[PDB]
């Protein structure tokens, strides 16, 4: 069950991922420690998100099994389709990054794997 407004608790490889993809140290030092809200509304295939990237609210919707355009940090807007296992594990192919989102009861983890860099968020359902 994915529906909820999930507040951020722990954020792992933020400094190593944002410098590896080409972002500024001034904006990285602002968004690294802010405990913001990460929303998801589960409508069968269409998952409507409202995500806090430090100060910016990035709101887009992903379709499980058909093409869906989402905003990236380095780039523009990526058509990344998401596959679902057991109503808790969401897997996609972003801008050369394997993104794995897992729901453990009422706590969600977003693990963005870029080769050796493992960018892991840990947010609780509210
Ligand atoms: C889907 C969950 C993962 C979301 C990851 C978002 C990563 C954002 C990374 C870097 C951008 C940080 C921007 C910080 C605010 C800058 C503007 C300001 O307040 O001055
Ligand atoms: C590089 C980050 C750009 C911002 C959008 C990233 C979207 C990734 C795609 C699909 C997974 C969406 C997961 C939504 C829940 C995030 C929970 C969290 O913030 O802790």
Swiss-Prot record:
It is found in: Cytoplasm. Pfam families: Lipocalin_7. The modification Phosphoserine is found at residues 10, 38, 55, 99. The keyword Transport applies. The modification Phosphothreonine is found at residue 50. Disulfide bonds: none annotated. This is Fatty acid-binding protein, liver. It comes from Homo sapiens. The gene is FABP1.
């Amino acid at each position: 069950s994915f529906s909820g407004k999930y507040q951020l608790q722990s954020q792992e490889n933020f400094e190593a991922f944002m410098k590896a993809i080409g972002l500024p140290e001034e904006l990285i030092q602002k968004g690294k420690d802010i405990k913001g809200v990460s929303e998801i509304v589960q409508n069968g295939k269409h998952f409507k998100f409202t995500i806090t990237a430090g100060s910016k609210v990035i709101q887009n919707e992903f379709t499980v099994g058909e093409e869906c355009e989402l905003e990236t940090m380095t780039g523009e807007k990526v058509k990344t389709v998401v596959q679902l296992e057991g109503d808790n594990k969401l897997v996609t192919t972003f801008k050369n990054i394997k993104s794995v989102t897992e729901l453990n009861g009422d706590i969600i983890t977003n693990t963005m794997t870029l080769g050796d860099i493992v960018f892991k968020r840990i947010s609780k359902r509210i």
